[PDB]
A paper describes a structure:
SEN has been proposed to contribute to the virulence of GAS by serving as a plasmin(ogen) receptor. Although SEN has the ability to bind plasmin(ogen), it also catalyzes the conversion of 2-phosphoglycerate to phosphoenolpyruvate as part of the glycolytic pathway inside the cell. Alpha-enolases are typically homodimeric, however they have been found in some bacterial species including GAS to be octameric, consisting of a tetramer of dimers. Each subunit is made up of an N-terminal domain (residues 1–143) and a C-terminal domain (residues 144–435).
The crystal structures for SENK312A and SENK362A were determined at 2.15 Å and 2.10 Å resolution, respectively, and were consistent with the wild-type protein in terms of octameric structure and packing of secondary structural elements. There were, however, differences in the subunit interface area when compared to the wild-type protein, with the total buried surface area for SENK312A and SENK362A corresponding to 24,230 Å2 and 23,070 Å2, respectively (the corresponding value for wild-type SEN is 24,912 Å2). In our SENK312A structure, the L1 loop region shows two alternate conformations similar to the S. pneumoniae structure. K312, on the other hand, is located on the outer edge of the octameric ring and is not involved in oligomerization. This may be the reason why this mutant behaves more like the wild-type protein. Differential scanning fluorimetry (thermofluor) experiments showed that the thermostability of SENK312A was similar to the wild-type protein, with the melting point of SENK312A and wild-type SEN corresponding to 61.3°C and 60.6°C, respectively. By contrast, for wild-type SEN and SENK312A, only intact octamers could be detected. Surprisingly, two SEN mutants bound more plasminogen than the wild-type protein, with the percent increase in plasminogen binding for SENK312A and SENK362A corresponding to 196% and 341%, respectively. Interestingly, the activation rate of SENK362A (3.73 x 10-9 OD/s2) increased while SENK312A (1.237 x 10-9 OD/s2) decreased, to 1.75 and 0.58-fold, of the wild-type activity (2.123 x 10-9 OD/s2), respectively. Enzymatic activity was reduced by approximately 38% and 46% for SENK312A (81.2 nmol/min/μg) and SENK362A (71.21 nmol/min/μg), respectively.
Residue numbers in the entry: 0 to 435
Write the structure that this text describes.
């Protein structure tokens, strides 16, 4: 009776932006314990599982999570207490059924995920094994190649830049520990460069800069300078570059065009899907770009197909809002040859079970799974363990400042350290979707 869940308790806490979220605590009869904190996205995909907010404009601007917390304590708890802490799938399924809606809108995806994660961590604690081992079994070894959101554009930046994120990726590093150092050193060299230019070195939600660049090319060219300044190569043997275009954010839903004037000021390109592909292609041709996320709009299936046809053999194409970590959508992307990669955000779908189903479905189509943070993060580092548990090979968990990002990198350092000689780092070979 030691392994039986005796307590499931949620409380309201704050994410890395100072907005409410929640965490759940799970205890077994034996006293094994797990805590699950939930992240939150800024701009959420139209098709994401529902994150339940209170909507009370007198508390936290209506962003309270006390309703979700109540749901955990008064509904989910009664249903889950009594399960063996190790019956992850059964528990995730029970919560899905208990909610009864496809988008988890009754109990809230954040309520459900908090329990889902807390239960798993409690089970790992109960078995006295690392979380990546509990989740993945014995054959966990691959530290993920990180893509690091070093420069920001899009809505929040005031530079004339449409793309939300510009990342660097230490594909040439021998270990994760060294890749991490590479990234940090380039980050710090970038800061120095920005100061010398008289640009702002304060950071955005994910710990990167949003400097007033001349535009997209200036940003990318500035990153390459930082890379060289730090003493690294720009290419497959060193550090490569990637985008999160977040094109749904400037996709004119009515004109169904990609309106750059939105972020790059009037007189900027307005592109059709075709012209959108051409643009991305020009950039891939110009620079050492290894990956592009949401180059097309979450619902521009035709555009995705074309893009994947044109670039999918040269460049990784990651569906984020396109797939919302949902096997229903990924299964279709696969059938219709759209994208060759999926960004995995656990709170887009809401259970570890469904998250792991998405990761497995991806692998089996030859797609990479890039485990991701959200813009609103916590001190939790579960996605580091998910990345290694599944030997995913890649992770997107932020720039090299802010503990909401660094906590994941630190956890990956611990995991690499505990794995010792078994630890692997695939670098450029992470991209089995490009036959590397």
């Amino acid at each position: 009776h030691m392994s039986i869940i005796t307590d499931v308790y949620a409380r309201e806490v704050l994410d890395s932006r100072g907005n409410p979220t929640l965490e759940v605590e799970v205890y077994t009869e034996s006293g094994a314990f797990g805590r699950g904190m939930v992240p939150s996205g800024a701009s959420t995909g139209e098709h994401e599982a529902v994150e339940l907010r209170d909507g009370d404009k007198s508390r936290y601007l209506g962003l309270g999570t006390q309703k979700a917390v109540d749901n955990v304590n008064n509904i989910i708890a009664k249903a889950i207490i009594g399960y063996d802490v190790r019956d992850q799938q059964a528990i995730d399924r029970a919560m899905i059924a208990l909610d009864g809606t496809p988008n988890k809108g009754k109990l809230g995806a954040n309520a459900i995920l908090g329990v889902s994660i807390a239960v798993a961590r409690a089970a790992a604690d109960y078995l006295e094994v690392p979380l990546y081992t509990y989740l993945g079994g014995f054959n966990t070894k691959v530290l993920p190649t990180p893509m690091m959101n070093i420069i920001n554009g899009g809505s929040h930046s005031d530079a004339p830049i449409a793309f939300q994120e510009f990342m660097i990726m230490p594909v040439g590093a021998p270990t994760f520990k060294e890749g991490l150092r590479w990234g940090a050193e380039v980050f710090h060299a970038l800061k120095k460069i920005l100061k010398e230019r008289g640009l702002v070195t304060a950071v955005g939600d994910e710990g990167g800069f949003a400097p007033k660049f001349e535009g997209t090319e200036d940003g990318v060219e500035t990153i390459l300078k930082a890379i060289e300044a730090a003493g690294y190569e720009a290419g497959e043997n060193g550090i490569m570059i990637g985008f999160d275009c977040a094109s749904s954010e400037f996709y004119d839903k009515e004109r169904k065009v990609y309106d750059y004037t939105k972020f790059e000021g009037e007189g900027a390109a307005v592109r059709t899907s075709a012209e959108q592909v051409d643009y991305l292609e020009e950039l891939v041709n110009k620079y050492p770009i290894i990956t592009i996320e949401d180059g097309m709009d979450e619902n521009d299936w035709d555009g995705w197909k074309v893009l994947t046809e044109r670039l999918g053999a040269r460049v990784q194409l990651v569906g984020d809002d396109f797939f919302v970590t949902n096997t229903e959508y990924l299964a279709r992307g696969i059938k219709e040859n759209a994208a060759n990669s999926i960004l995995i955000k656990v709170n887009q779908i809401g259970t570890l079970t469904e998250t792991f189903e998405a990761i497995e479905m991806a692998k089996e189509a030859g797609y990479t799974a890039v485990v991701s943070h959200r813009s609103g993060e916590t001190e939790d580092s579960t996605i580091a363990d998910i990345a290694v548990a599944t030997n995913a090979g890649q992770i997107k968990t932020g720039s090299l400042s802010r503990t909401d990002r660094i906590a994941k990198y630190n956890q990956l350092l611990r995991i690499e350290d505990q794995l010792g000689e078994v630890a692997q780092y695939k670098g450029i070979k992470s991209f089995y979707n490009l036959k590397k």
